Structures are given as structure tokens and as C-alpha cells.
């Protein structure tokens, strides 16, 4: 769970020293950003029915071959579990925009990701098609502020780079 405080406390812990001015300095960086990266968590928390519906069918629009017989979404519960997965991923992005780190993305969606999908034959292109669609559906002055728009997109492109 790499946040900004977990980074400095464990770094001080290695040498068994007392939190010095380096370690105190990093926490005020989680004061100036964190007044406005939590408004993105407001935008994600109240809009999450619509942003995972709008991104859930974007991958099926790009990849219509999945809905055939004996594929990722062969039947209806395949699509239900796919929308479940897009909801899970946007929840971890909402966590990362809150904590101030990529911890909850890493150890809950990114660690062991490739393995599962590979064995479960879940195309990675379908998963990145939704997050990439959500990244460019956002325009800055309508949905959030300027500080929120960059930090919300930065957690999305981090997961895009991690998934493929």
C-alpha cells in the first residue's frame, strides 16, 4: 500500500532512525494536492453507475467478436461479470485517488492480473478498451477541476500501462 507516508516511514525504518525533516516534508505534499484530488473521488463516487455503463459497452463495441458462442461473454452472465470487473477497477482507481498512492491498484488489481486473465482466457484488449475510453471521455472544465483532471487520468493511464 504505497502511499506517501508508507514510503517515508519504511525508508526511515530501514535505518531505524527518527522521522527527520525529509520525512516531515513529504506529508505537506499530501496537503496541497490532496485538497483537490479528493474532488475527483466525489466525481467518481456519485457518477459510477454511468461511467461503468458507458465504458462497459465500449469494449463490446470495439470487440464485438466476444459475444459469439464460446467466448469471453458467450452468455449474459459473462457480460454481467465483465461489468463487475470494470466496476472493481474503477473502485480501485477511486481508492488510489483517495489514499494518494497506487497501493490499492497494485495489490488488489495489478498483482497477479496477467496470470488470472491468461488462464481464464480474458482478453487484455477488452479491459484496456474501457479504461482508455474513460480516459478520453473526460473533458476538464465540465466534470472536475484542472488539478483533478490530471490526477484522475494519471491513475487511469498507470493501470493502462500496468495491464499491457
Amino acid at each position: 500500500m504505497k502511499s506517501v507516508i508508507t514510503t517515508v516511514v519504511s525508508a526511515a525504518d530501514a535505518a531505524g532512525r527518527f522521522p527527520s525533516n525529509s520525512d516531515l516534508e513529504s506529508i505537506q505534499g499530501n496537503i496541497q494536492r490532496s485538497a483537490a484530488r479528493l474532488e475527483a473521488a466525489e466525481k467518481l463516487a456519485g457518477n459510477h453507475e454511468a461511467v461503468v455503463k458507458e465504458a462497459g459497452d465500449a469494449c463490446f463495441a470495439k470487440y464485438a467478436y466476444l459475444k459469439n458462442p464460446g467466448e469471453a461473454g458467450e452468455n449474459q452472465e459473462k457480460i454481467n461479470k465483465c461489468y463487475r470487473d470494470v466496476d472493481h477497477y474503477m473502485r480501485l482507481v477511486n481508492y488510489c485517488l483517495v489514499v494518494g498512492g497506487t497501493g490499492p491498484l497494485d495489490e488488489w488489481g495489478i498483482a497477479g492480473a496477467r496470470e488470472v486473465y491468461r488462464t481464464l482466457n480474458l482478453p487484455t484488449s477488452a479491459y484496456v478498451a474501457s479504461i482508455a475510453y474513460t480516459r478520453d471521455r473526460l473533458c476538464v472544465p465540465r466534470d472536475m477541476s484542472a488539478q483533478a483532471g490530471v490526477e484522475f487520468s494519471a491513475y487511469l493511464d498507470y493501470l493502462i500501462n500496468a495491464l499491457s
Binding site: 508508507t6 522521522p19 463516487a45 477511486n94
Partner: protein, 177 residues
């Protein structure tokens, strides 16, 4: 480990929900008082030295039986181990105060220290008191009620942080008891 921001996330993940505004405030009060917290911890780290010497010598000043032929802090090797342990406990309490959460002070300080002190023969009555004191010094340094040294600050109330570190210290005391 966790901090104050992570514990609401862990608590809300076991309820399958996003970070709404219903519990986002308490964090704004926690983030709004960030400067006060940083004023609080610096008061303990700056007097971390004198705190262990005032604590461990006071332990013997109230118990002259832990230094006699057959007492744990008796010899020169054991005194260094006890003065080391006191400062380790103070270091983890300062970690928990800076974090706002007590996640690091439960699985990396008190976890597995009960049987460790039982296999060595470290008195439990002398340990509790030792840690209990460090608490009286910390609540005096937080509120700037220290009789020997005063520091410079902006004026106001700090009993919330004094209470948080007071709850951390007897949390240390309850685990080794």
C-alpha cells in the same frame, strides 16, 4: 501498515462502496489539522533523548530492585538493552502519531513481544510503568506544559493529538501486560 486515510478505505471496502461524502469530512478535519499534527510530532522527536533517560531512571527511582544482584537491568549489558527497548517503543508511538492510525503499532512492535519478554524474564510491572511514564512526558510536550523546556508555536488547542498519543501509549501497555 495503514494510516488514517487507509483505515476508512479498508472499512468501506468490506461494505462494497466508494468514498462518499458521508465519511469524507472526518478526513477533511484530519487533513485540515495536518499542520497541527506536524507541530505535535516534532515536539516528541526533539525531546526523544531526554524522554528515555527521564523514563528509565525514574523506573529505578521508584524500584531499586531492578538493579540489584539478580535484577534484569542490573548489569551494564542489560541496561543498554532496556534503554534501547524504551526508545524503540517511543519510535513506534511516534510512527503511530504521525500516521494517525495504529496499524504499525500492532503488527510490528507489540505483535510477538509477549512471549519474547516471557522467555527472557522481563518484569511486566516494571515494563508497563516504564511505558506509562513516557506517556506523561509526551502529553506535557504536546500541550507545551513541560516545566523545564518551552517551545515556540502558534496558539490554540492540541488536546486531540495529546489524547491520540495517550491512547497509543496504554495500547502499548495493554499488549505487553
Amino acid at each position: 501498515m495503514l494510516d488514517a486515510f487507509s483505515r476508512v478505505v479498508v472499512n468501506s471496502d468490506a461494505k462494497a462502496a466508494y468514498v462518499g461524502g458521508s465519511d469524507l469530512q472526518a478526513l477533511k478535519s484530519f487533513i485540515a489539522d495536518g499542520n497541527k499534527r506536524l507541530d505535535a510530532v516534532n515536539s516528541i522527536v526533539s525531546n526523544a533523548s531526554c524522554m528515555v533517560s527521564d523514563a528509565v531512571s525514574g523506573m529505578i527511582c521508584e524500584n531499586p530492585g531492578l538493579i540489584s544482584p539478580g535484577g534484569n537491568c542490573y548489569t551494564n549489558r542489560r541496561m543498554a538493552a532496556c534503554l534501547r527497548d524504551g526508545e524503540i517503543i517511543l519510535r513506534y508511538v511516534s510512527y503511530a502519531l504521525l500516521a494517525g492510525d495504529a496499524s504499525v503499532l500492532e503488527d510490528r512492535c507489540l505483535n510477538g513481544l509477549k512471549e519474547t519478554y516471557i522467555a527472557l524474564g522481563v518484569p511486566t510491572n516494571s515494563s508497563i510503568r516504564a511505558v506509562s511514564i513516557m506517556k506523561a512526558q509526551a502529553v506535557a510536550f504536546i500541550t507545551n506544559t513541560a516545566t523545564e523546556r518551552k517551545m515556540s508555536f502558534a496558539a490554540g488547542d492540541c488536546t486531540s493529538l495529546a489524547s491520540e498519543v495517550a491512547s497509543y501509549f496504554d495500547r502499548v501497555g495493554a499488549a505487553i501486560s
